[PDB]
Structure formats: C-alpha cells, structure tokens
Amino acid sequence: NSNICEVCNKWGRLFCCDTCPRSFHEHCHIPSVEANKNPWSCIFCRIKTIQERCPESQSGHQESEVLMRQMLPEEQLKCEFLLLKVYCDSKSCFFASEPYYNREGSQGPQKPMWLNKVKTSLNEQMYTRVEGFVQDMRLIFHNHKEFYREDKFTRLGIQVQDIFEKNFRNIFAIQETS
Numbered sequence: 445n446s447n448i449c450e451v452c453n454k455w456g457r458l459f460c461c462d463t464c465p466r467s468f469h470e471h472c473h474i475p476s477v478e479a480n481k482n483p484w485s486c487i488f489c490r491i492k493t494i495q496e497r498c499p500e501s502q503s504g505h506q507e508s509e510v511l512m513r514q515m516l517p518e519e520q521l522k523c524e525f526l527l528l529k530v531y532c533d534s535k536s537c538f539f540a541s542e543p544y545y546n547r548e549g550s551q552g553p554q555k556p557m558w559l560n561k562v563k564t565s566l567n568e569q570m571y572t573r574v575e576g577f578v579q580d581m582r583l584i585f586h587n588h589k590e591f592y593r594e595d596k597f598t599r600l601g602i603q604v605q606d607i608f609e610k611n612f613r614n615i616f617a618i619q620e621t622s
C-alpha cells in the first residue's frame with residue numbers, strides 16, 4: 445500500500461484499502477473510513493465494481509437525465525466519489541471551509557456554499573436527487589466568480605470547477621460532445 449493519503453498526499457494515521465494499494469486518512473476518505481470491515485474496500489474500488497457489474501453503465505448519458513436521478517445507494521456513492529475527486533486537488537483548500545465576504549466594491553453571495561457543507565449534507569442524506577448535489581457544487585464556484593470580479597483570484601474558481609466538471613462527466617458517463 446501507499447504511504448501517503450490518496451486525497452491530501454500527507455503521511456499520518458492511514459487506513460489501507462484491501463483491494464487496491466491506496467491509503468487514506470479517516471476523514472479524507474468519503475464516506476469516513478468505516479470502523480470495522482475486514483476486508484475493506486475504498487471508494488475507488490467500490491466505483492470500479494459498479495462499472496464491472498454493469499458495463500453498459502459506461503455508455504453515454506444526457507446530463508438532464510443524470511440530474512433527475514433519485515439518490516439511491518449507487519448515485520449516493522457516485523456523488524461521494526465526485527466530491528472526493530474535488531478534495532484530491534490541493535486548490536480545494538480555498539473552497540473547503542465556510543467563507544466570509546468583505547471586499548471593497550463587492551457584496552457577498554445570497555447563498556454561501558462550501559465543500560464541507562456539501563460533505564455534511566451528503567452524510568446526512570439531505571439530497572434526494574443528483575441535481576441537489578450538483579447545484580450546490582456549481583454554486584461554490586459561481587459564488588466565487590461573482591465575488592472576486594476582475595481580481596485574478598477568480599481563476600481559482602475556474603480551475604476547481606474544471607476539475608469538478610471533468611470528474612462529473614467521467615463518473616456519470618456523460619455523452620461526449622464537441
């Protein structure tokens with residue numbers, strides 16, 4: 445197994461996957477690494493299994509169809525993995541905790557959003573459809589773009605949104621287009 449956490453790339457108290465060489469801090473894994481379970485399989489392995497069990501799940505999908513899916517166990521897991529993929533980028537630190545807004549010439553968003561709030565919402569099963577999760581994720585970056593206006597810091601929002609959107613298209617097998 446790896447000697448650093450797959451998500452934050454630091455050593456520490458790590459839990460090892462039994463079916464692949466990845467390792468995780470307890471609360472870096474999503475969901476948090478389970479108390480017992482021997483063997484234990486990580487979220488990467490659990491997602492791979494879903495695909496292997498239903499090869500046709502990788503055929504192209506319409507985003508509109510994906511968004512209306514109810515959050516049954518498999519869709520719950522996929523949103524958890526997509527969240528984890530965002531945390532895997534070091535630039536997610538800017539969007540992780542609750543923001544505050546006091547900049548000359550800007551006003552804060554009407555509905556603030558951040559990754560830890562989405563993490564909690566997933567953990568507490570507050571989303572009934574994929575759309576709920578995706579809307580809050582996209583709101584994070586849209587709030588950032590609107591607030592930081594012409595400051596070059598706006599680009600961090602563009603960058604992390606691109607990681608989100610690429611991983612969304614991959615995980616939910618969205619039909620490729622030009």
Ligand SMILES: [Zn+2]
Pocket residue numbers: 449450451452453454468469472
């Ligand atoms: Zn970690």
Ligand SMILES: [Zn+2]
Pocket residue numbers: 461462463464465466485486487488489
């Ligand atoms: Zn694994």
Ligand SMILES: [Zn+2]
Pocket residue numbers: 497498499500
């Ligand atoms: Zn099948």
